[PDB]
With several copies, the nearest count.
Chain A
Amino acid sequence: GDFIEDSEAVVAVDAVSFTLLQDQLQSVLETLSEREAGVVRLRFGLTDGQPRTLDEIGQVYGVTRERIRQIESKTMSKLRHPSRSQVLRDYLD
């Protein structure tokens, strides 16, 4: 019985790097327009942890779901832009 690993045990190096990843995102997001960053956070549920539908994010900014879908595509090609993405690469897994 004492040879069994605990698979749900917290690994220190990951929780720390996850803390560090949570830092780098907060920074990269600061390079986006207030609404651009705000839409990404709600879309993926960064702050709350609860993701939101395009219609729901359109409800906070007062637009259609399609408008949000558009703003989403743009900020993502902005995020995909190498100057923003270069730093997050090593967090692949």
Chain B
Amino acid sequence: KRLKVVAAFQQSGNSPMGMVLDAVPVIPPELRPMVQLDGGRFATSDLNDLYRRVINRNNRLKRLIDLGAPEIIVNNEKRMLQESVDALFDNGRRGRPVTGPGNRPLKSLSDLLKGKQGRFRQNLLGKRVDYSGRSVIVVGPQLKLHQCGLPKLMALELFKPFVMKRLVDLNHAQNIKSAKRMVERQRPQVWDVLEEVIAEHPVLLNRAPTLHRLGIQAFEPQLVEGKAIQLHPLVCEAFNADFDGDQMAVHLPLSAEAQAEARILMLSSNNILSPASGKPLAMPRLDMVTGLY
């Protein structure tokens, strides 16, 4: 085992000296911001109090060195200096963690990367996205398999930049500023326009949790009255969708490639069989059984 570390340093050009720090980097300020909330009260990152202990103790150390001081005092400073840089990098990894008011430990640099709330899982492997919405879902029994009911208010916001262009093309609005107000106030002209842009323009529907890829499927949006989402009754199986009040997210593919992938790869009617057993999924169930039986 001990060889694995000693060998690693030979092949690389890394000086093992790197494991001791003469200098500590300082992260840019906007990544550890200090800002005033609405009302003027201030909030800042824990990183700054952590950086503050380090620099406080380093500066005191300089002071004691210059006066001359018994090792007891000086060595005490160096021990404190060591612990503060520990807390900065990884807090609580040794000893009790540095805490703030209410005794809650401060978040270290390591605390950024790690965990479900760290950068990787929170901000990297997933994230929040533009051009998306959600609502509660209701049954679609009159829909064709490739279609979905989309709340017209929801459709309007989702497609807002598209219609804004369209109603400037048609002369409804003279400039983009006027187009934006026309959509916000929901002046009646926009609806006919919405149906234009939404035509044959697909959208992805997702219900959490997403277990198999069939948990996202593309459909053909249909403007619908009401604030709910009309879901075709044959896709419940794949989404595991209960109408007990489940909600579903809508996503608007933008680029030509994204729309192609929606129509070809993810379209509802092209995904019927489960891609595990090959058995049919969209096959009738419940009511539709007893009706045909």
Contacts and interface: CB of A to CB of B under 8 A. Distances in A.
A63 interface: no
Interface in A11-26: 13, 16-17, 20, 24
Contact of B45 (A1, A16, A87, A91): A1
Nearest to A13: B180
B178 interface: yes
Interface in B148-185: 161, 174-178, 180
B43 interface: yes
Contacts of B37: 4
Contacts of B208: none
Contacts of B177: 17, 90-91
B35 interface: yes
Interface in A54-93: 87, 90-91
A90 B175 contact: yes
Interface in B217-257: none
Contact of B35 (A4, A13, A91): A4
Indicate the size class of the contact surface on chain A.
10 to 19
Query: Which residue, A20, A24, A90, A91, has most C-beta atoms of chain B within 10 A?
Result: A90
B40 to A, nearest CB: 14
Given A1-B45, A13-B180, A20 B175 contact: yes
Contacts of B43: 1, 4
Contacts of A16: 176
A67 to B, nearest CB: 35
Interface string A12-44: 010011001000100000000000000000000
A23 to B, nearest CB: 10
Contacts of B33: 1, 4
Interface string B30-59: 000101010000010100000000000000
Contacts of A87: 174-175
Contacts of A91: 175, 177
Query: Which residue, B43, B174, B175, B178, has most C-beta atoms of chain A within 10 A?
Result: B175
A19 to B, nearest CB: 9
A90 B178 contact: yes
A50 to B, nearest CB: 28
Contacts of A20: 175-176
Nearest to B164: A13
A36 to B, nearest CB: 24
A7 to B, nearest CB: 9
Nearest to A16: B176
Contacts of A13: 161, 176, 180
Nearest to B168: A20
Query: Which residue, B45, B161, B177, B180, has most C-beta atoms of chain A within 10 A?
Result: B177
A17 B45 contact: no
Nearest to B174: A90
Interface of B: 33, 35, 37, 43, 45, 161, 174-178, 180
8 contacts: A1-B33, A13-B161, A17-B177, A20-B175, A20-B176, A24-B175, A87-B174, A91-B175
Closest 3 CB pairs of A and B: A90-B177, A17-B176, A90-B175
Given A20-B176, A91-B175, A91-B177, 16 more contacts: A1-B43, A4-B37, A4-B43, A13-B176, A13-B180, A16-B176, A17-B175, A17-B177, A17-B180, A20-B175, A24-B175, A87-B174, A87-B175, A90-B174, A90-B177, A90-B178
